Coordinates of C-alpha atoms and ligand atoms in Angstrom, one line a residue:
Chain A
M1 CA 63.7 103.7 189.9
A2 CA 61.9 103.7 186.5
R3 CA 63.3 100.8 184.4
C4 CA 60.7 100.9 181.5
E5 CA 59.3 97.4 182.2
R6 CA 56.6 95.9 180.1
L7 CA 53.6 95.7 182.4
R8 CA 51.8 92.4 182.4
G9 CA 50.8 89.3 184.3
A10 CA 51.0 89.3 188.1
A11 CA 52.9 92.6 188.1
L12 CA 50.0 94.2 186.2
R13 CA 47.5 92.7 188.6
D14 CA 49.7 94.0 191.6
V15 CA 50.2 97.6 190.1
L16 CA 46.6 98.1 189.2
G17 CA 45.4 96.4 192.5
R18 CA 47.4 98.8 194.6
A19 CA 46.5 101.9 192.6
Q20 CA 43.7 104.0 194.1
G21 CA 43.2 105.8 190.8
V22 CA 44.5 106.4 187.3
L23 CA 45.2 109.8 185.7
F24 CA 44.9 109.6 181.8
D25 CA 46.5 111.8 179.2
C26 CA 44.0 111.9 176.3
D27 CA 45.4 112.2 172.8
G28 CA 47.6 109.2 171.9
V29 CA 46.1 107.3 174.9
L30 CA 42.3 107.2 174.7
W31 CA 42.2 108.1 171.0
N32 CA 44.1 109.3 167.9
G33 CA 42.0 112.1 166.3
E34 CA 38.4 110.9 165.9
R35 CA 39.3 107.2 166.4
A36 CA 39.1 105.7 169.9
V37 CA 42.0 103.3 170.7
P38 CA 40.2 99.9 170.6
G39 CA 39.4 98.6 174.1
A40 CA 40.0 102.1 175.7
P41 CA 36.3 102.6 176.5
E42 CA 36.0 99.1 178.0
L43 CA 39.1 99.8 180.2
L44 CA 37.4 102.9 181.7
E45 CA 34.2 100.9 182.3
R46 CA 36.1 98.2 184.1
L47 CA 38.0 100.7 186.2
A48 CA 34.8 102.3 187.4
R49 CA 33.6 98.8 188.4
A50 CA 36.8 98.0 190.2
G51 CA 36.1 101.0 192.4
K52 CA 39.1 102.9 190.9
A53 CA 39.0 106.6 190.3
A54 CA 39.8 108.0 186.8
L55 CA 40.8 111.5 186.0
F56 CA 41.7 113.0 182.6
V57 CA 44.5 115.5 181.9
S58 CA 44.9 117.1 178.5
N59 CA 47.2 119.9 177.3
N60 CA 44.6 120.6 174.6
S61 CA 43.7 124.3 174.8
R62 CA 41.1 124.1 172.0
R63 CA 38.0 123.2 173.9
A64 CA 36.2 124.7 176.9
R65 CA 35.0 122.1 179.3
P66 CA 31.5 121.7 177.9
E67 CA 32.8 120.9 174.4
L68 CA 35.5 118.6 175.9
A69 CA 32.9 116.6 177.8
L70 CA 30.9 116.1 174.5
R71 CA 34.1 114.8 172.9
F72 CA 34.7 112.1 175.5
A73 CA 31.1 110.8 175.1
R74 CA 31.3 110.8 171.3
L75 CA 34.5 108.7 171.4
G76 CA 32.8 106.0 173.6
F77 CA 33.8 107.2 177.1
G78 CA 30.3 107.4 178.7
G79 CA 29.1 108.3 182.2
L80 CA 31.9 110.8 182.9
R81 CA 31.3 113.8 185.1
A82 CA 32.7 117.1 183.7
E83 CA 34.6 117.4 187.0
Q84 CA 36.8 114.5 185.9
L85 CA 38.1 116.4 182.9
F86 CA 41.1 118.8 183.1
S87 CA 42.6 120.7 180.2
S88 CA 45.3 123.3 179.9
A89 CA 42.6 125.8 178.9
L90 CA 40.7 125.3 182.2
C91 CA 43.8 125.3 184.4
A92 CA 45.3 128.4 182.6
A93 CA 42.0 130.2 183.4
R94 CA 42.3 129.1 187.0
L95 CA 46.0 130.1 187.3
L96 CA 45.3 133.6 185.9
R97 CA 42.3 134.1 188.4
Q98 CA 44.8 133.1 191.1
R99 CA 47.8 135.1 190.0
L100 CA 46.8 138.1 187.9
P101 CA 48.7 141.0 189.5
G102 CA 47.4 144.6 189.9
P103 CA 45.4 146.3 192.6
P104 CA 41.9 144.9 193.3
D105 CA 40.7 148.4 192.5
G106 CA 44.0 143.3 185.0
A107 CA 43.1 142.3 181.4
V108 CA 44.6 139.2 179.8
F109 CA 45.9 139.5 176.2
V110 CA 45.2 136.1 174.6
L111 CA 46.8 134.4 171.7
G112 CA 44.3 131.5 171.2
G113 CA 40.9 130.4 170.0
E114 CA 37.3 130.8 171.0
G115 CA 37.2 127.7 173.3
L116 CA 40.1 129.1 175.3
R117 CA 38.5 132.6 175.5
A118 CA 35.3 131.0 176.7
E119 CA 37.1 129.2 179.5
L120 CA 38.9 132.4 180.6
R121 CA 35.6 134.4 180.7
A122 CA 33.9 131.5 182.7
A123 CA 36.7 131.9 185.3
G124 CA 35.8 135.7 185.6
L125 CA 38.8 137.0 183.6
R126 CA 38.6 140.2 181.5
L127 CA 40.2 139.8 178.0
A128 CA 42.0 142.5 176.1
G129 CA 39.8 143.4 173.2
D130 CA 36.6 142.6 175.2
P131 CA 34.6 145.8 174.9
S132 CA 35.6 148.7 177.2
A133 CA 33.3 150.4 179.8
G134 CA 31.5 153.5 178.5
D135 CA 34.2 155.5 176.6
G136 CA 37.0 155.1 179.1
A137 CA 40.5 153.7 178.5
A138 CA 41.0 150.0 177.8
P139 CA 42.1 148.1 180.9
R140 CA 45.8 147.7 181.5
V141 CA 47.0 144.3 180.2
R142 CA 48.6 142.4 183.1
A143 CA 49.1 139.0 181.5
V144 CA 49.9 137.6 178.1
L145 CA 48.5 134.1 177.6
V146 CA 49.9 132.0 174.8
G147 CA 47.6 129.0 173.8
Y148 CA 47.0 127.1 170.5
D149 CA 46.3 130.0 168.1
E150 CA 45.5 129.1 164.5
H151 CA 45.4 132.8 163.8
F152 CA 48.8 133.5 165.2
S153 CA 50.5 136.4 163.3
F154 CA 53.5 138.6 163.3
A155 CA 51.3 141.6 164.3
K156 CA 49.9 139.6 167.3
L157 CA 53.5 138.6 168.3
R158 CA 54.5 142.3 168.1
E159 CA 51.5 143.2 170.3
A160 CA 52.4 140.5 172.8
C161 CA 55.9 141.9 173.0
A162 CA 54.5 145.5 173.6
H163 CA 52.5 144.2 176.6
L164 CA 55.5 142.3 178.0
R165 CA 57.7 145.4 178.0
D166 CA 56.1 145.9 181.4
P167 CA 58.1 143.5 183.7
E168 CA 55.0 143.1 186.0
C169 CA 53.0 141.8 183.0
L170 CA 52.8 138.0 183.3
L171 CA 53.7 135.7 180.5
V172 CA 51.8 132.4 180.7
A173 CA 51.7 129.4 178.2
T174 CA 49.0 126.8 178.2
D175 CA 51.6 124.1 177.3
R176 CA 54.8 123.6 175.4
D177 CA 53.8 120.7 173.2
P178 CA 55.9 121.4 170.0
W179 CA 53.5 119.8 167.4
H180 CA 50.7 117.2 167.2
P181 CA 50.2 114.4 164.7
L182 CA 47.1 114.4 162.5
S183 CA 45.3 111.4 161.1
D184 CA 46.8 111.7 157.5
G185 CA 50.4 111.6 158.9
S186 CA 50.9 115.4 158.8
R187 CA 51.4 117.6 161.9
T188 CA 50.0 120.8 163.2
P189 CA 52.4 123.2 165.1
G190 CA 51.8 123.1 168.9
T191 CA 51.5 125.9 171.5
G192 CA 55.2 125.2 172.3
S193 CA 56.2 126.6 168.9
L194 CA 54.2 129.8 169.4
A195 CA 55.5 130.1 173.0
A196 CA 59.0 129.8 171.6
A197 CA 58.4 132.8 169.3
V198 CA 56.9 134.9 172.2
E199 CA 59.7 134.1 174.7
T200 CA 62.4 134.7 172.1
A201 CA 61.0 138.1 170.9
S202 CA 60.3 139.3 174.5
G203 CA 63.4 137.8 176.2
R204 CA 61.0 136.4 178.8
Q205 CA 60.5 132.9 180.2
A206 CA 56.8 131.8 180.2
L207 CA 55.1 130.2 183.2
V208 CA 53.8 126.9 181.8
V209 CA 50.4 125.7 183.0
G210 CA 50.0 122.3 181.4
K211 CA 51.9 119.1 181.7
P212 CA 54.8 118.6 182.6
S213 CA 54.3 121.6 185.0
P214 CA 53.5 120.6 188.6
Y215 CA 50.9 123.4 188.4
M216 CA 48.6 121.0 186.4
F217 CA 48.6 118.6 189.3
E218 CA 47.7 121.4 191.6
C219 CA 44.8 122.2 189.3
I220 CA 43.6 118.6 189.3
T221 CA 44.0 118.2 193.1
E222 CA 42.2 121.5 194.1
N223 CA 38.9 119.6 193.8
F224 CA 40.2 116.0 194.3
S225 CA 42.0 114.3 197.1
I226 CA 44.3 112.0 195.3
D227 CA 47.4 110.4 196.7
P228 CA 50.1 110.6 194.0
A229 CA 51.9 107.6 195.6
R230 CA 48.8 105.6 194.7
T231 CA 48.0 107.1 191.3
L232 CA 49.1 105.8 187.9
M233 CA 49.9 108.4 185.3
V234 CA 49.3 107.0 181.8
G235 CA 50.5 108.9 178.7
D236 CA 52.1 108.8 175.3
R237 CA 54.7 111.6 175.5
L238 CA 58.0 111.1 177.4
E239 CA 58.8 114.8 177.8
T240 CA 55.3 115.7 178.8
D241 CA 53.3 113.0 180.5
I242 CA 56.1 110.7 181.9
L243 CA 58.1 113.7 183.2
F244 CA 54.8 115.1 184.7
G245 CA 54.3 111.8 186.5
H246 CA 57.8 111.8 187.9
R247 CA 57.6 115.4 189.0
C248 CA 54.3 114.5 190.9
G249 CA 55.6 111.3 192.4
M250 CA 53.2 109.0 190.4
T251 CA 53.9 105.6 188.9
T252 CA 54.2 106.2 185.2
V253 CA 53.0 104.1 182.3
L254 CA 53.9 104.8 178.7
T255 CA 51.4 103.7 176.2
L256 CA 52.8 103.1 172.6
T257 CA 49.7 104.3 170.6
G258 CA 50.9 107.9 170.4
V259 CA 53.9 110.3 170.0
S260 CA 56.7 108.6 171.9
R261 CA 58.4 105.3 170.9
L262 CA 59.7 102.5 173.1
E263 CA 63.1 103.0 171.5
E264 CA 63.3 106.6 172.8
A265 CA 62.3 105.6 176.3
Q266 CA 65.0 102.9 176.2
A267 CA 67.6 105.4 174.9
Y268 CA 66.8 107.8 177.8
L269 CA 67.2 104.9 180.2
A270 CA 70.6 104.0 178.7
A271 CA 71.7 107.7 179.1
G272 CA 70.6 107.7 182.7
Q273 CA 67.9 110.3 182.1
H274 CA 65.5 108.7 184.6
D275 CA 62.8 111.5 184.7
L276 CA 62.1 110.8 181.0
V277 CA 61.9 107.0 181.6
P278 CA 58.5 105.4 182.3
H279 CA 58.2 102.9 185.2
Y280 CA 56.1 100.7 182.8
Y281 CA 54.9 100.6 179.2
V282 CA 52.0 98.9 177.4
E283 CA 51.3 98.5 173.7
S284 CA 48.0 100.2 174.3
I285 CA 45.9 100.9 177.4
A286 CA 43.6 97.9 176.3
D287 CA 46.5 95.8 177.8
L288 CA 45.6 97.2 181.3
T289 CA 42.1 95.7 181.4
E290 CA 43.3 92.2 182.1
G291 CA 44.9 93.3 185.4
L292 CA 41.5 94.1 187.0
Chain B
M1 CA 92.6 137.2 175.4
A2 CA 89.6 139.7 175.2
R3 CA 89.6 141.8 178.4
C4 CA 87.0 144.5 177.3
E5 CA 89.5 147.4 177.4
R6 CA 88.4 150.9 176.6
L7 CA 90.2 151.7 173.4
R8 CA 92.0 155.1 173.4
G9 CA 95.2 157.0 173.1
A10 CA 98.4 155.2 171.9
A11 CA 96.6 151.9 172.0
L12 CA 93.9 153.1 169.7
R13 CA 96.6 154.6 167.4
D14 CA 98.4 151.2 167.5
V15 CA 95.3 149.0 166.9
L16 CA 94.0 151.1 164.0
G17 CA 97.5 151.5 162.5
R18 CA 98.0 147.8 162.4
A19 CA 94.5 147.0 161.0
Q20 CA 94.4 146.5 157.2
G21 CA 90.6 146.9 157.3
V22 CA 87.5 147.3 159.4
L23 CA 84.3 145.3 159.2
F24 CA 81.3 147.2 160.4
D25 CA 78.0 145.9 161.7
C26 CA 75.4 148.5 160.8
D27 CA 72.4 149.1 163.1
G28 CA 73.6 150.3 166.5
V29 CA 77.0 151.2 165.0
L30 CA 76.6 153.5 162.0
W31 CA 73.0 154.5 162.9
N32 CA 70.0 154.0 165.0
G33 CA 66.9 153.9 162.7
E34 CA 67.0 157.0 160.5
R35 CA 69.6 158.8 162.6
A36 CA 73.3 158.5 161.8
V37 CA 75.5 158.2 164.9
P38 CA 77.2 161.6 165.0
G39 CA 80.7 161.4 163.6
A40 CA 80.1 158.0 161.9
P41 CA 80.2 159.3 158.4
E42 CA 83.4 161.2 159.1
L43 CA 85.1 158.1 160.5
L44 CA 84.4 156.2 157.2
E45 CA 85.8 159.2 155.3
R46 CA 89.0 159.2 157.3
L47 CA 89.4 155.5 157.0
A48 CA 89.2 155.6 153.2
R49 CA 91.9 158.3 153.4
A50 CA 94.1 156.3 155.8
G51 CA 94.1 153.6 153.0
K52 CA 92.1 151.3 155.2
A53 CA 89.4 149.0 153.7
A54 CA 85.9 149.1 155.1
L55 CA 83.2 146.4 154.7
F56 CA 79.7 146.3 156.1
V57 CA 77.9 143.3 157.5
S58 CA 74.2 143.5 158.5
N59 CA 71.8 140.7 159.5
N60 CA 69.0 142.8 158.1
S61 CA 67.0 140.7 155.7
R62 CA 64.6 143.5 154.7
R63 CA 66.5 145.1 151.8
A64 CA 68.0 143.8 148.6
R65 CA 71.4 145.2 147.8
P66 CA 70.2 148.2 145.6
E67 CA 67.8 149.5 148.4
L68 CA 70.6 148.8 151.0
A69 CA 73.0 150.9 149.0
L70 CA 70.5 153.8 148.9
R71 CA 70.1 153.6 152.7
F72 CA 73.9 154.0 153.3
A73 CA 74.1 157.1 151.1
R74 CA 71.0 158.7 152.7
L75 CA 72.5 158.3 156.2
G76 CA 75.6 160.2 155.2
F77 CA 77.9 157.3 154.1
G78 CA 78.9 158.4 150.6
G79 CA 81.2 157.0 147.9
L80 CA 80.5 153.3 148.8
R81 CA 80.6 150.5 146.2
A82 CA 77.6 148.1 146.4
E83 CA 80.2 145.4 146.7
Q84 CA 81.2 146.6 150.1
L85 CA 77.7 145.8 151.5
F86 CA 76.8 142.4 152.8
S87 CA 73.4 141.5 154.3
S88 CA 71.9 138.2 155.5
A89 CA 69.5 138.5 152.6
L90 CA 72.4 138.5 150.0
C91 CA 74.3 135.8 151.8
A92 CA 71.2 133.5 152.2
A93 CA 70.6 133.8 148.5
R94 CA 74.2 132.8 147.9
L95 CA 74.2 129.9 150.4
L96 CA 71.0 128.5 148.8
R97 CA 72.5 128.7 145.2
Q98 CA 75.5 126.8 146.6
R99 CA 73.6 124.2 148.7
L100 CA 70.2 123.5 147.3
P101 CA 69.9 119.8 147.0
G102 CA 68.1 117.8 144.3
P103 CA 69.3 116.6 140.9
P104 CA 70.4 119.3 138.4
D105 CA 67.6 117.9 136.1
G106 CA 64.6 122.8 143.8
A107 CA 62.2 125.6 144.8
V108 CA 62.7 127.6 148.1
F109 CA 59.7 128.2 150.4
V110 CA 60.3 131.7 151.8
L111 CA 59.0 133.3 155.0
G112 CA 60.0 136.9 154.4
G113 CA 59.4 140.1 152.5
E114 CA 59.8 141.4 149.0
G115 CA 63.4 142.6 149.4
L116 CA 64.5 139.1 150.5
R117 CA 62.5 137.5 147.6
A118 CA 64.2 140.0 145.1
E119 CA 67.6 139.0 146.4
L120 CA 66.8 135.3 146.1
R121 CA 65.5 135.7 142.5
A122 CA 68.6 137.8 141.6
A123 CA 70.8 134.8 142.6
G124 CA 68.8 132.6 140.2
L125 CA 66.6 130.8 142.8
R126 CA 63.1 129.6 142.1
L127 CA 60.6 130.4 144.8
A128 CA 57.6 128.4 145.9
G129 CA 54.6 130.2 144.7
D130 CA 56.4 131.8 141.8
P131 CA 54.2 130.8 138.8
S132 CA 54.5 127.2 137.5
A133 CA 55.5 126.2 133.9
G134 CA 52.6 125.6 131.6
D135 CA 50.1 123.6 133.7
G136 CA 52.6 121.1 135.2
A137 CA 53.1 120.3 138.9
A138 CA 54.6 123.0 141.2
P139 CA 58.4 122.3 141.7
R140 CA 59.4 120.3 144.7
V141 CA 60.3 122.5 147.7
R142 CA 63.9 121.7 148.7
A143 CA 64.6 124.4 151.2
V144 CA 62.6 126.5 153.7
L145 CA 64.1 129.9 154.3
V146 CA 63.1 131.9 157.4
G147 CA 63.8 135.6 157.2
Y148 CA 62.2 138.7 158.7
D149 CA 58.5 138.2 157.9
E150 CA 56.0 140.8 158.9
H151 CA 53.3 138.6 157.5
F152 CA 54.3 135.5 159.4
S153 CA 51.2 133.4 160.3
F154 CA 50.2 130.1 161.8
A155 CA 49.2 128.9 158.3
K156 CA 52.7 129.7 156.9
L157 CA 54.3 127.9 159.9
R158 CA 52.1 124.9 159.2
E159 CA 53.1 125.0 155.6
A160 CA 56.8 125.3 156.5
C161 CA 56.4 122.2 158.6
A162 CA 54.8 120.2 155.8
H163 CA 57.8 120.9 153.5
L164 CA 60.2 120.1 156.3
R165 CA 58.6 116.6 156.7
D166 CA 61.1 115.7 153.9
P167 CA 64.4 115.3 155.8
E168 CA 66.3 116.3 152.6
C169 CA 64.5 119.6 152.6
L170 CA 66.9 122.2 154.0
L171 CA 66.0 124.6 156.8
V172 CA 67.8 127.9 156.6
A173 CA 67.5 131.1 158.7
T174 CA 68.8 134.5 157.6
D175 CA 69.7 135.2 161.2
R176 CA 68.7 134.6 164.8
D177 CA 68.5 138.2 166.1
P178 CA 65.6 137.9 168.7
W179 CA 64.2 141.5 168.4
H180 CA 65.3 145.0 167.3
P181 CA 64.9 148.3 169.1
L182 CA 62.8 151.0 167.4
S183 CA 63.2 154.8 167.7
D184 CA 60.3 155.3 170.1
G185 CA 61.7 152.7 172.6
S186 CA 59.5 149.8 171.4
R187 CA 60.8 146.6 169.8
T188 CA 60.0 144.5 166.7
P189 CA 60.3 140.8 166.9
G190 CA 63.4 139.5 165.1
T191 CA 64.0 136.6 162.7
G192 CA 65.3 134.6 165.7
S193 CA 61.8 134.6 167.1
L194 CA 60.2 133.2 163.9
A195 CA 63.1 130.7 163.5
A196 CA 62.4 129.5 167.0
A197 CA 58.8 128.8 166.1
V198 CA 59.8 126.9 162.9
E199 CA 62.5 124.8 164.6
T200 CA 60.2 123.9 167.4
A201 CA 57.3 122.9 165.3
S202 CA 59.4 120.9 162.8
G203 CA 61.9 119.5 165.4
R204 CA 64.7 120.7 163.1
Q205 CA 67.8 122.8 163.7
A206 CA 68.2 125.7 161.2
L207 CA 71.4 126.4 159.3
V208 CA 72.0 130.1 160.2
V209 CA 73.5 132.3 157.4
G210 CA 74.0 135.6 159.2
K211 CA 76.2 136.7 162.1
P212 CA 77.5 135.0 164.3
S213 CA 77.7 132.1 161.7
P214 CA 81.1 131.7 160.2
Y215 CA 79.2 131.4 156.9
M216 CA 78.7 135.2 156.8
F217 CA 82.5 135.6 156.8
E218 CA 82.7 133.1 153.9
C219 CA 80.2 135.2 152.0
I220 CA 82.2 138.4 152.6
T221 CA 85.5 136.8 151.7
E222 CA 84.3 135.2 148.5
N223 CA 84.9 138.5 146.7
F224 CA 87.4 140.0 149.2
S225 CA 90.9 139.0 150.2
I226 CA 90.8 140.0 153.9
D227 CA 93.1 138.8 156.6
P228 CA 91.0 138.2 159.7
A229 CA 94.1 138.7 161.9
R230 CA 94.4 142.2 160.5
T231 CA 90.7 143.1 160.5
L232 CA 88.7 144.9 163.2
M233 CA 85.1 143.7 163.7
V234 CA 82.9 146.5 165.2
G235 CA 79.4 145.9 166.5
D236 CA 76.8 146.5 169.1
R237 CA 75.6 143.0 169.9
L238 CA 77.7 140.7 172.1
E239 CA 76.0 137.5 171.1
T240 CA 76.0 138.3 167.4
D241 CA 78.9 140.7 166.3
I242 CA 81.4 140.1 169.1
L243 CA 80.9 136.3 169.0
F244 CA 81.2 136.5 165.1
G245 CA 84.5 138.3 165.4
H246 CA 85.9 135.7 167.8
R247 CA 84.8 132.8 165.6
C248 CA 86.5 134.5 162.6
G249 CA 89.7 135.4 164.5
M250 CA 89.2 139.2 164.3
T251 CA 89.9 141.8 166.9
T252 CA 86.6 142.8 168.3
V253 CA 85.3 146.3 169.2
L254 CA 82.0 146.8 171.0
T255 CA 80.4 150.2 170.4
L256 CA 77.9 151.3 173.1
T257 CA 75.4 153.1 170.9
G258 CA 73.3 149.9 170.3
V259 CA 71.8 146.8 171.9
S260 CA 74.5 145.5 174.3
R261 CA 75.6 147.3 177.4
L262 CA 79.2 147.6 178.9
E263 CA 77.9 146.0 182.1
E264 CA 76.8 142.9 180.2
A265 CA 80.3 142.5 178.5
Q266 CA 81.9 142.9 181.9
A267 CA 79.5 140.3 183.4
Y268 CA 80.5 137.8 180.7
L269 CA 84.2 138.6 181.3
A270 CA 83.7 137.9 185.0
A271 CA 82.0 134.6 184.2
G272 CA 84.9 133.6 182.0
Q273 CA 82.7 133.5 178.8
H274 CA 85.5 135.0 176.6
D275 CA 83.8 134.5 173.2
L276 CA 81.1 137.0 174.3
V277 CA 83.8 139.5 175.6
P278 CA 85.0 142.2 173.2
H279 CA 88.7 142.9 173.0
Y280 CA 87.9 146.6 173.1
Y281 CA 85.0 149.0 173.5
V282 CA 84.2 152.6 172.5
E283 CA 81.3 154.9 173.6
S284 CA 80.6 155.3 169.8
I285 CA 82.6 154.7 166.7
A286 CA 83.3 158.5 166.5
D287 CA 85.9 157.7 169.2
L288 CA 87.9 155.7 166.6
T289 CA 88.6 158.7 164.3
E290 CA 91.3 160.2 166.6
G291 CA 93.4 157.1 166.1
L292 CA 94.0 157.8 162.4
Ligands
PLP1 C1 46.3 122.0 170.1 C2 46.4 120.7 170.8 N1 47.0 120.7 172.1 C3 47.1 119.4 172.7 C4 46.7 118.2 172.0 C5 46.5 116.9 172.7 O1 46.9 117.0 174.1 P1 47.0 115.7 175.0 O2 47.9 114.7 174.3 O3 47.7 116.3 176.3 O4 45.6 115.2 175.3 C6 46.2 118.3 170.8 C7 45.7 117.0 170.1 O5 44.7 117.1 169.4 C8 46.0 119.5 170.1 O6 45.3 119.6 169.0
PLP2 C1 64.7 142.9 160.5 C2 66.0 143.4 161.0 N1 67.1 142.6 161.0 C3 68.3 143.1 161.4 C4 68.4 144.4 161.8 C5 69.8 145.2 162.0 O1 70.8 144.3 161.7 P1 72.3 144.7 162.0 O2 72.4 145.2 163.4 O3 73.1 143.4 161.9 O4 72.8 145.8 161.0 C6 67.3 145.2 161.8 C7 67.5 146.7 162.2 O5 66.8 147.5 161.7 C8 66.1 144.7 161.4 O6 65.1 145.6 161.2
CA3 CA1 49.0 112.8 174.7
CA4 CA1 56.8 102.0 169.9
CA5 CA1 73.9 145.7 165.1
CA6 CA1 76.7 151.0 178.0

């Protein structure tokens, strides 16, 4: 099982050689804020050359796919197809298209920003507060979606609760990341904090779209035939990316350039909490390139 | 132990006769919104006549003591001394006066309304955003207090987190009630929902002031010699008032005019969760009067 081994040498050559593809978490892995992890772009270049597939999975609900694609390019990750990029915004839009109840024969009440709303509308979803048809009633709200919402308020929370009074109204969260580190050492609250407030006030459990939910893997694999037994999952958060990998049956690699510390992985290992223990770790993903 | 017995007849006469005093939760017990529970005022009148002490304990952080006292009178509860009324606002102010760290050799950042702020200032506390002395630096924030905040926002959450980056900064919540029922059947989010968001984003556990924290009982008993072995605790919420009573060693009485249902108490009893099981229940507190 996962023993949190430092991946290097012949083992690294073996692990990467056997892998048919690599699934990358983004923040803490490819970059921190506006700074690419040195050697990250070169890894992705060498992977493409090695004939190994690369896919990208982020819990970030801020950007619709077109703006996400621009961000990869800007940070040095060139030549990527938009189809290789998966975010919790995109997959939440897809989950709601697939699951929204109501007769054919709802509207979605969204706590979140314009990039999220853009992604939802692109998937064909009607949003609460979109303008109504003629002067008829507003459509019935059949899901509440909690994403990263820099305009979160008590009034919006109260309104979310009102919608959720109907037990057939879905409650969905893009992700449960509790907070994110910023470049100056400060932190921004994460969607997990807002989801906590909504779940508490409504007495509901949210359906989570993003990592570590297996749903995210369903979203990625709708379009892509990938064998999880031959896929490496690389990420910086034990409770999100490494747990995701284990749930999906992938080999997990913790990179140490982000949120989680080696000491924490080792502590979980000691406590026998194996689903929070990576199979392997690297100081940064630049350490992988040698294995090709 | 607690067996959730319907309190009536000779048993009621015995229980009330032996009691030296009664501690009442307020909402769901004495009133629902602006409507007194019929017969509640008459109970309190008869209790005073029986020579039995009455004290009142509410998690409501909206009103400072003077406005709270007006509310009791208005609902039909006359003749009360302000000293008999305890709220999570009053006791949070007291806890912070007692615990605020820093040299003699802080300020308190408050998420909450004007009644809470009034209570804190009356206890001698300086509040973040109170005006600074001359043109010197703002005082160091040494506690974050989360109360009922109808103006809660993402920006305030972010700011709470910034203060909490200092591990010596306290995190205190007035209460963890998750939501409260309104007269039209709707609900308002409770402090517990906001506390959840703050704890999640900061990765901290809050110190809770109100019920079911034993601290609330310390607050009430600072001024009042009451024997918990001779005190009845009467409330409508299993996870708040009944748990509080058990933690304090009081005889607990669930009234059925509020949040918790008899069926839920019986379910907990069945599951052997005795600290969430009331010793006794009544349809409403008006059922107690006969026992005098
Ligand atoms: C709101 C939000 N969600 C998620 C993340 C990053 O997600 P991931 O680490 O899954 O790429 C960030 C990082 O910027 C963020 O700002
Ligand atoms: C914000 C808030 N806190 C607490 C409560 C009631 O508290 P309790 O049931 O402890 O009296 C209410 C009920 O109105 C409320 O509005
Ligand atoms: Ca990450
Ligand atoms: Ca480390
Ligand atoms: Ca109550
Ligand atoms: Ca009942």
